[model samples]
Target chain A: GMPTINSIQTTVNGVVKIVKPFNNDIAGEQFDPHVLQTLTAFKQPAILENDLAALRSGSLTPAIADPVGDAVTVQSRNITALNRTVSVEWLTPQNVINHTVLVYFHGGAFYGGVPGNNTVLLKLVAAKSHCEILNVDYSLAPEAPAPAGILDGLAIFQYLEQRDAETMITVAGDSAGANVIMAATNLNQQLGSNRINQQLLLYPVTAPNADHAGPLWDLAAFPIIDSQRAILTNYHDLFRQLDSIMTDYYVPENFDSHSPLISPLHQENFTMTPPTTIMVGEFDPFRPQAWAYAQRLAAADTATTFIQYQGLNHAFAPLVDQYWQSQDVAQVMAAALI
Target chain B: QGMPTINSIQTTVNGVVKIVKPFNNDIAGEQFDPHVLQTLTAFKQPAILENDLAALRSGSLTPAIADPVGDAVTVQSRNITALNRTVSVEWLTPQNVINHTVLVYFHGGAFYGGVPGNNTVLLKLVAAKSHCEILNVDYSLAPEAPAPAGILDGLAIFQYLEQRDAETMITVAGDSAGANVIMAATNLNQQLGSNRINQQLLLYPVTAPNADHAGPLWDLAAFPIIDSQRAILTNYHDLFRQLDSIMTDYYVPENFDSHSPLISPLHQENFTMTPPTTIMVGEFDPFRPQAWAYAQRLAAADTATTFIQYQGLNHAFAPLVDQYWQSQDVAQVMAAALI
Candidate 1:
């Protein structure tokens, strides 16, 4: 029951994963060498066949989230739609708040990923947010493209609504999964059913277009860490190329890239979307687009909380092995829920 | 006839008058322009209180280059006996006005620094842009007395305006401590009899007093600041806390519920009755969070509100329109709202 000086104990992949103590005492005052190390190590390129196989195993990956107790217990159920059946894992936490259920969409750029990768994260959120979690194992692209993954997402959401109209549903996702959730929400808005409680967007990719040479820090401020700046640029360049992979292979061929279905940032009426909490890394190349999305929501009178975690970069949440920020984000998102 | 003792110049580029001053200072690089530095450097060390007050009497702290056009607008000053003290107010009436919207402005400085005369340039700019006459209110400050003195003076002027100019649209406006007074007064008037103020414009409003132990202030030496963010806080938060301690002590009474919305706008409970409010804060400002908290709650009450954060600037950047383009942006936004 004891812990290290600022260390945290949580369950990663249903096993105790105690994060080592970290010194983030003064965030903006100096660079975090450990945090910088993670951003440099995040240079994985195109999603190859082996990568998809490894991701689709539905086995645990290195991620810190679920608490180390019986707070959240895992179970499973299947829902079928249009000859496509997907497994929906239920993470029922103790003392569910207001009978609310939150569903999370996993992000692997719409190509490959598994519900198990985010199962611990969902459990952690369920415990912290006082809401039950449902990880949707939706279809991915190349195996299944645009409407397939999005259809799996929307059909699951619609099915959840039909079961209990009284149940409050909150939808969330990370990166490309976030893109799918936004598209699903767009469809729900047309039906005029305002049942979705709130949106939790963690490092969302709101646009299809991205340049490789994006700046890491605030250009308006005119200063940056020179030692890490070049490496950070390389990390971002890797993701920009991946952006093309997600766009060309996942989105229907020759289809409009600006379609609101694919890139929800270009939606016609942002106010129609639910209240949103956008959490992006300061070093994230997606930071600027997420900022624009935050402003658009705020400008439309949609209550939005945009937070930039200092001294961190993209994929900080799931890189439980590489960065300690993944453990801190639970506290951040918990506040958003309450 | 005499040589200029300080460095300040007036420049006009494309009809916009800019009162160019030297950079505030290197330490001040966190939150201020360098021009005001020379004066604050000379006066700040010896007499900080005198430094703020002296600007009001002779208009030296932060000067304005823009002046009211005499042919178009008539300027008048009045000393009205109200409540416990005589209230000083200046009236700026344009020849032709729109919407009959009359603005009442209060200057900033933790409730002790600025005065009516020092605000001529800003008031004239807003009045002409919004096409509304302005009534600049100069209330009492700290050390004279604490909480409710400045509040009472502002309320008295507002009440007098209501009686003297009935059916006129009243818009309440202020910056920093001035914002604190007007927010208190405007809300007080709202609950008393529903002569609801039309709109409110707050610039980096002080909602809460500096905590006795602000973590950032105490840990300035080894505080970890990202290289990207050093420009925002380079010892600015530390220095502000030093002055903030005195301001908070001098302004609030002993054992006061520091969270009272009368002074702390962040703790306001009556959002339903609150008028449409516009809040502007600097990105680096220590008080931006409080202003933002109020804006979100105020807007959640379905009150039409706009919350803007100007990046890469310091507190009270709105009034210094000549220094940063963000300040110019503030002027334009304020003008759009007043109309």
Candidate 2:
């Protein structure tokens, strides 16, 4: 029986039979042990500051990565020589018969994060719906440098296209990943790999200028401190160092706002790109730009579904376990993908 | 670093990694074992079937445990004496600034579930929004058939007026629980209870004749089967069976439908029942005929808010996990409650 008032009273009386656990009377309020360690073991030099400077500088270059063995088929660890081997882990559901594929990229301010971070979310997408996911693990900046990640992403797109997967492909990414995916899509069109079926930007890093310069969008901003393990050594000069690198990679603001790839925001000629689904978090810093891009795509008459996840923060999709709203956003995206 | 693909090489390689572990392999595949012990275990009935059966049965009667005793203030427990803690209602949020309270009713189908199943969704609403707390009360049924359970529920609601603030009141509510609350509302008005609710939200409720015959709407021809599926097999039914001594006083449906408190469907007069905030699911259900006619009669009389029909939806759609229609229904309910 559901506990009634009688049971509630009896339960209260029975409490006398229960033993109390030892308590630490000196416990402090608002003490987060996780945050303390993350702050103390800061990895990058003020990740946020670096993210901004790299966006403003606009000096674009390609990122490179160490060659990881390809285990695409079971029992075979094939290694190939090249500038880099960017493996795209498709998160869409298993191809029981045949399925559409969404190539996904993760957001990490262009400098941090690995493909593993996006695995759980991508798997959820696969489980919830019937679609194949191609998660691109591109090289990051400062290590691989600017344009390199974008180049690798583009190469993966080309690889997929070469395999005749262009007809069923949808290029997608979150924040910085979106920025590069957009760039890769544009580059692919130029290289004659025009098989991309659609593009979906999830609270994307659409505006490099605002991000690098002051007045960056807070809605899309996530605390990279949460991602990195080390604390800042020289916090003051961190922005200065980052600003120099951002000029090369985060160049969407300076590129032809008209090019569908460079500035999907300015590209009114969406007739060329595939149908699109742009999801923006209400509190995302990149919300305005993503919205602008979505409108531009819709205006071009390419099928478009623009949704705003209310009460959400940037990078909400990847770290959904932290918030209920994030899960809702992910659900919406999963629905849209279907 | 990410994986690279070389243009000149004709070789293609892919990686497969296990993500979620500890998943039931039996779900998608058949099991075969090498040993007789494993073979014997495999021969046992599947748990999924039991789960499905539990889902079909309804009611809440189960073993009762005394509340936990503790010095904690945030989560405290309470009780009632011989006063028929009958229909328990609590307000988690006050309506000082608003005009409506989301009234929810719990179904006692026995642990297989009746009202609590749907209440799960209502609970989510209360937790998500600060606008309103819900009025969740219990109703009686077999094996505790007939008398006091119905009256007790009515009495609980009648008492609510004394406890609740009058001005801010809208009772938007749903199924087995819906009937109990509706009867409670009727009794409260009939007995000249202190307070009266402004609105009612009725879900797929049991409106058929009881005991000897099903109500005009509910065809109990399949009643036995439905009862077994939705109530008897459910643990709550076991409770009624256990209390077979005074069952008539508890299970109202089995004895008679005309009992004012037991079966309120027969009392649908145009005059007294508070204008209902009614909604119903249309898919061969027991309450279909009367619930439909109830809406028509209310409409003929031009009640404040009439019933909203959810097509292709079955009984207790809102309560089911992954009930695709819940989001839309919840949104509409939210608007009504807010207004």
Candidate 3:
């Protein structure tokens, strides 16, 4: 009646049984069937990519139109900061939370991507959190590197604060966009700006070094996915290569990979940031870093909420329509906002 | 007017300067808040209450009476088995909370002295902040029941909560010796596969209770709170010198390993799967070093941890929630993390 992604035979309670791995427990937890369904639909035969090269060029971000279905108008505004002009997109939802702006940065491993990629998830976020969204479209690597993106993030933060000192600001992002939010929050603290009301990070790449291998290889062991072990393994390896290349272009020549700005995971102190809500996919390569950062932040006595979405894959936010887990992300983010 | 009181004293902890206030002004080997001294003065404290195990046969405090026995909460009690012996368990369900989040509380008093009756108000307040039911377990104390017994009791409760409740999310809370039990059971649970516990709230727990576990903070010869025998006022002195030196020999399992992680959590080497923990202690408490050290270990292990030290206060100040702001902070903070 349906396509079988994975199957395994095992003995339980003195009897042998055949089961769909995800339907059962593996490594002490269970994964959602839809997680694999979506993975197979998007990744298989297409478990795919030039994705490696497109990743290098930061040109892999997909453009989805009007996720809100209202076909809302998105305004483009430019702000001058860090010796250049940075263009940011602004979208106000139906019922906006007054005096609050959620500034977001998209991820293309720090080198590329556009706000267009997150229009759907952000619209969902705005509708639920009842806040206006300012999706930042900043310059990527090769042309601008290191603090360039971080400066742009902070400049817009300053612009918003100056425009209305009473406004509440939440800095957010995913992947490298999440990475930029990390640095800007730190900069906000260092500069004594103290303006970040909260930070929402989704599947962030905290460590940008090549040697800092993620849990990508471990995805092979996620129960049902083992059947596609060879497929997932090669796919992840290709991703590692693609990521390593983009990372090289990110932190210009003088910077070390673990520089606090480059790697907030190893940042010495997180005492200044406000409340934090970290939503990370259970199988994301960055899951380990997300947990580590959460541990470090909580140790600093910062208010923190670490939500591990079950059976989800990396960058699944755009898959909101495809996964209920994606919609749950917006709900959790909304809870954090209110 | 009376001479100006020393409302707060300046002190340094882990390189941070903090201004702290004592419970009362008491003159002895050192200066301390007089209110704590007044209570200390009320009892020409006879610790002989311990040492003899049978004295507690008078009947260990049952769950708690929840002071008001208030209309806002439901109190239920039952008996359960741990290590083959029956132990008491009580559930305090607040007026309207998802009952799914249960705080299993272990009482403290050097592992030998806590009376749940005395903790009614504290338990009620904790339930209020956490907005969850309190599953209070009264384990067998020293003499009749010892070290591993309490840990086994904790383990039993964890299992019961998991098997008995369908929508279970367990959070463990304890103070002093009770915290020791929760942690030892935690390490044991991790060994068997870290399960059950969603979060941990330890209030000035006893992490290193062994004779050889003494650090600078453990020196009773020092002045102020650490010097438990310093005579102050008309006829009172601090209680429990064992708090700094070798603690009561009453409850320690016979011939125990001084550094056993079960008896002293600071000895834990592997914290790989420990639950997120919020550890709170008073700056003046003699047991602060161990709490601080444990926090360091958890952070280094990359487990979520929150450690707080209240300036000018000493051990077991949660009862002072009525007077101190930080006292209430512990419940609210750990409570916020439950999400």
Candidate 4:
């Protein structure tokens, strides 16, 4: 029989005790203990009536942090490209030698993240890889939808290309940012430029509606960011609206979801594509789709390196500051640049 | 559309003039070189159509060579019995090393050709490099014995090794059809609750009996190898058009279950208990898809596994010991994984 969700009560110290109900079967036999503890600490977010208005209220600022010491320096700049405002940050370390530039696209599900939110990740990358980091603050959805962010990503690449043509450049992103980097790569290739040398996709969302309903789908229930919380907080709705806006903005009006520009997984010809390193959480809902994309890349003989981190969630790259495995992934990304 | 021929012409004048029309028509227009394609032409034997009987009767065999690296290795052959049937096994042991690990190898012949001698080069090399003994099993081929016979013989050898000693680590390895046997034997070991085999080296295996599900890797028209879809179908037809006939000659129509894990290891429900595994396949082999699928399944089931597709090589490239560079590279990978 299938295990049902229920809480049990018992007397551990001669007093009444209540144990929370957790579906251990779906939690998987191999989940990391620390990750399990961290994820279980937070209560799942719920959808509110004024979620859209709340997001636009300007109360949420980018989580960028100040440099700790002399080892790293941080700088912020604003640019007007394609008649759109884009904010970006640069994190440079003192030991940086290789003229390698990593353009990072921060993940916020297209509507709710800031470039400065991953300051720890940027600092660690700068210190370890000895490369400069550029964090792009692409516009969010509903206010400045799909192609708006994608265009900002492209504009940043163009900005970098003019400054340093000989430097090795890599485009990296997580979740929605991953999608932007992918879109930017496609657009860059089409524009007769092959500036981006490599890519680092962290738990990327390759397809539009990758959320299927079932046991595997239910497995997403365990974490700081479950699908239920996404739906309740209206992030799921934003994704849905963003999907429609993406189809309207990036592809032909009548084109379906299989458009290569919108979903690079549908792209058949990967002959000229740059070498890629894709890392995804083993328990993330996007695992299946990411695996498929990895398979496609390998089949195309594109020198793809794929890694699945066990007992992690989507957009877990930000935990690099504190988590050993996450720090290991940062090193993997750093090594991939060379 | 067909196999091309080579032509050579010479004329004498002030200097020698020669025109050579080499058989470059069938060369796959991908990553493979012309020299590699020309070398493959030697293996196009018409006797391959006759299948297992012809292979068993052929007395012309390559003599086993000594260790290439100055290692003191001894080779011997012996016959053993389990369940009242005789099975031939070859042992290769290297001196001046810790006797902690032993490798049990199975050779690939599409359930037809190939014997213990054909794999002596690899066995001797692994023994010398890894400083371990190797037991190369010469299992019975189809149209003579069949599916369960070979699997049972493998189990017998495994049982023999276990009874001899329990402290030494045992690793089972095979290439092509032999990979299938290793997988099947693992499944049987799991079912019988005997945790005998500890590790696996699946090299370019034939996993599923069905050909259509071979997706992406089944590009038969692109490259030529020992066992292509057409050749397998011909062998199947010769075995009386029954799919089960290819794995074993003892199959009856009513009891032929293609979904058995012994036939297709991919059919196993769970692989959590299976030992750590290393799988390698040629980039051009039709078996790549199946190997990848098997790797994915094992990984998903939380089993430790590694997969590598050797670039620009064809099926059963192990025998190209000195000719192909990848043979040495493959042996290094095997030694690294085992030793």
Instruction: Encode model 4's per-residue lDDT on B96-147: one tens digit a residue.
Output: 5556578889887666556777778666667656777888999876546667
Model 3 C-alpha lDDT per residue in residues B1-339, reported as the tens digit of each score: 001133445554443333343433343224444334434554454443343444543423434221321333456778876446677876766655656788888877667666554455556556654567787777767646777778888888777777787778888878887888888887787687747787888888888775343445455443344344354421221333444333446667568764677777888778767788877776556677677778777777777776765554566766444334455456555557553
Model 3: per-residue Cα lDDT over A248-329, one tens digit each: 7787888877788888987888778677877776666676666677777777877776766655557777656556556666
Q: Per-residue lDDT tens digits of candidate 1, residues A1-338? A: 22223544543222222323335364342235666533434344333222232222212232223343478888888997656687888777777776477878877677655565566666666788787777887777765778777778777777777787877667788878888887887887787777787888888888875543443233432224677656565665656666776677677766666788887878888878888877766666677777777777777877777665566666557544334566556655666665
Overall lDDT per candidate, in order of appearance: 0.64, 0.45, 0.64, 0.61
lDDT of 4 by residue, A64-150 (tens): 222344577878888665566678888898778665799888765555555655667777778767788888777665456566677
| Each model's DockQ score | 0.01, 0.02, 0.01, 0.01
Q: Residue by residue across A245-317, what tens digits does model 2's lDDT show?
A: 4434444334432344444565435567677766664434566666666656656666666665433334556
Q: Which ranges of candidate 3 are over 4 A from the true structure?
A: A1-32, A37-53, A56-67, A71-73, A81-83, A210-225, B1-339
Candidate 1 per-residue lDDT over residues B1-339, each given as its tens digit? 001122334443332222323222123123343322222343333333333544433432466432212223457888876555778888876545775578888888776556666666556556655678787887777757567888888778777777776787788888887888888888888878857488988888886666434443234443333464443454465456666676776677886755687877667876888888777766566676566667767767778777665544457766654334455456556778877
TM-score of structure candidate 2: 0.41
Worst 10 residues of 2 chain B by lDDT: B65-74
lDDT of predicted model 1: 0.64
**What 10-residue stretch in candidate 2 chain A is worst by lDDT?**
A1-10
True contacts kept of each: 0.00, 0.00, 0.00, 0.00
Q: Model 1, stretches more than 4 Å misplaced?
A: A1-31, A39-60, A63-66, A81-84, A211-223, A319-324, B1-339
Which window of ten consecutive residues has the lowest lDDT sum in model 3 chain B? Answer: B63-72
The best candidate in terms of DockQ:
2
Model 3 residue A31 CA deviation (Å) reads 5.8
Per-residue error (Å), model 2, residue B232: 23
